[PDB]
Please model this.
Amino acid sequence: KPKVRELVAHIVALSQHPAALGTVAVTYQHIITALATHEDIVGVGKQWSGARALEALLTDAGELRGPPLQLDTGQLVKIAKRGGVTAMEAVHASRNALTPLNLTPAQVVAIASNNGGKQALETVQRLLPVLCQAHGLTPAQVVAIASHDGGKQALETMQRLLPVLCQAHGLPPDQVVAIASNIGGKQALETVQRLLPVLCQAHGLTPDQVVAIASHGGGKQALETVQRLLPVLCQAHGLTPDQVVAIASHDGGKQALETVQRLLPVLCQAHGLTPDQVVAIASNGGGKQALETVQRLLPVLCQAHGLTPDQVVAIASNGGKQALETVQRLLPVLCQAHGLTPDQVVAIASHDGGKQALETVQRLLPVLCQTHGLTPAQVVAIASHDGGKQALETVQQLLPVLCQAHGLTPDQVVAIASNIGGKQALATVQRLLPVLCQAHGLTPDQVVAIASNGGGKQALETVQRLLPVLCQAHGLTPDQVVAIASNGGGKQALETVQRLLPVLCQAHGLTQVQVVAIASNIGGKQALETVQRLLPVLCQAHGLTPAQVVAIASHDGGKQALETVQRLLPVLCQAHGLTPDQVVAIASNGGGKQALETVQRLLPGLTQEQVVAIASNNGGKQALETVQRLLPVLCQAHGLTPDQVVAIASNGGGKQALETVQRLLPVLCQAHGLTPAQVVAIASNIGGKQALETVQRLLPVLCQDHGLTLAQVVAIASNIGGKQALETVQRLLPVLCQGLTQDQVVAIASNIGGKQALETVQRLLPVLCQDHGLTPDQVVAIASNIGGKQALETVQRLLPVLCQDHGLTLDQVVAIASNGGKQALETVQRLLPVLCQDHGLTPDQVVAIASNSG
DNA sequence: TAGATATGCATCTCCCCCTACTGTACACCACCAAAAGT
DNA sequence: TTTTGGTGGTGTACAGTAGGGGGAGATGCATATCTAAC
Model:
């Protein structure tokens, strides 16, 4: 009865368990005496030495569940899976010798668990001391070379060749540890010596280039295909040195390069696919699998899902063969069944994970929506990061657990799942969460905000480990720490702070506050160290105090900025005459290095006050570049002058604003009457792209249904937050009038942050008509300042105290909530005592803050 | 040799961490001119 | 003179995009002796 398509003393289908066979160690019996899954034991009798490995396991496992054996379980299954009966024997033999002292079980399992099992093992107990002695290495690195198949060839050709490499090629030791700590270990070490110089003096390869071309599995194979194939491309494909080079610094480097020579031209010649891009799809784990797959799937994806070649490529880049493929398989099943768009889908498929998430999304989409109350969006946003499957999975297995073990909201948990690390971070969460509230004085939010950012696990950890300490003689009020552990270079920052806090005050008399504001950016370490060098250089020889260094140094990426000054600072005054104080300014917004450089390049109709300006925001680079691109094209619509476009661009969403004035200047002037002036007003603001667009898609509805005029809608849209302003105005207009008035709403909304102002009214609307009584209008009158959603909130929080505790009148408070709002409000409440208390004064002139009066 | 027995090497897929660049929204403040009380 | 408004500059978050690394596990074939049925 043939589960269909020299068995065996039962034909294969014996103890009906699964069909999950062979199973070819042609060797079989359960014989079970259980103690894990079927998937494991099967996964072990699948190997040379299967049975004998299952039985030996029995002698170490029974020799486990009585006395202190040093080990976990599936751990033991791992020793038997990859180590074989062989390694398993070398362990319940050598265990006490390792327990001395060797290593942790962490690192024993780690080196017994391969093919050189027993040898790798036996060897390490022979050469670990001689490695930490005569060469000073670590229980860490050594067991990191034995840890892969070949540890015996690995360690040995490490003791023979470590010298030749530095006695004639001088590669730092940590660099040979990076050449050996791999599968071809030996074959890397070997092919370095044989081929290290025969290129540099015939090709020009930075010695660190090939150290990192050999720091993978396939070393021998990468340089032999670099040296061999290098010209064909650099000839009639002409890639730079470092391009071919970096296509080669990965596992299975050879076939990346070989499929380039093979497929590079034939791709772009009849697939408009830049060389530069092909090179990108090559340069990744398994790239060949990409190029190969790509030639077959580019046109079918573009012609069945109408995908753009840049998306298919973007997916090819880091989702790989499995990701494109998985998107062929499931584009329809998804985009056209569970509410998805071929863009949210590509979004999911354009990360290493790839296949792995798309699938885990398919399955658990409703499971997490239907049940644990999420939306397709929030799920397709926990899915779009390298650790997709992982993060989604754990969200499912920890959401109500986190919601009940303490009380962490839902939206809040989605925020922790949605970056790389969702698992490790939600798992360092459940670990350390309480260990920091009753026992370490950090709140819930104060910590989810450590999870929620890029930092994750490594950053929550360095916090318990280093938050008590740091405040011993470094000071740093927690506020200061929780901020530091909240960026990407998290763990890196906190450490580097323990490091150079003193070398900064003990050298630059640079305050604390001054520094916690450097350890507080996505790229902490990169800056602390880079100011240590580049501080003395500047203030001394150029012109900056400490401030101007720290100011330049405090954005995600401090490093690049400083460096691009020391290099390019002078030149901008020695050729470009930008008053240095204007140059420490085109360089202290996040894209620093990049804006500096693009002034150097591009500066050469316009001025310096005017150019320092356009480049001074995050736009920086794409700011100017687009300016040149469009300044011409723009002064030719009914639009602009030179002044105008400049003002459009002196703001963060620059390039976005411009290309949205361009793509939409004459589109709604045929739907309304916008002089180009009005348009420029909507876009000479942060978030143009969103304010022009929304103005276009939402203009019809208001004017036609709600009657809102043009001017009204333009007063709305031309403040900062147009999109929010509008999309919140329309949403909530009807609801207010039915006793608010049309213009009262429009007014409250016609201020920056109108969206928020409108809301806090809709919300705290009754509380004031109902309690310490106030009329809709005095209220509207508070809510229409920029004070807004803030002066209102505080005004309820303080009606009690100022009228009762202090002695005030509802019409004086409104007249502050409506003049100086929030701060002026509290500050009054909290300054009245003083003046009356030192040497004679009265609460008569202290309200509102009457001019003078002395 | 055939093929166990035991170990070495290459390649491919996935999951994790750090750093740099870009873009949107809010809240305050302060300075200077129109617009009004008086 | 007071009362508003308008503009620009500053500080700060919050939100999105982009690629630099490494490292673990699986599978499949590649060797090196030794053992074993032929």
Observations:
- Residues 478 and 565 of chain A are 33 Å apart (CA to CA).
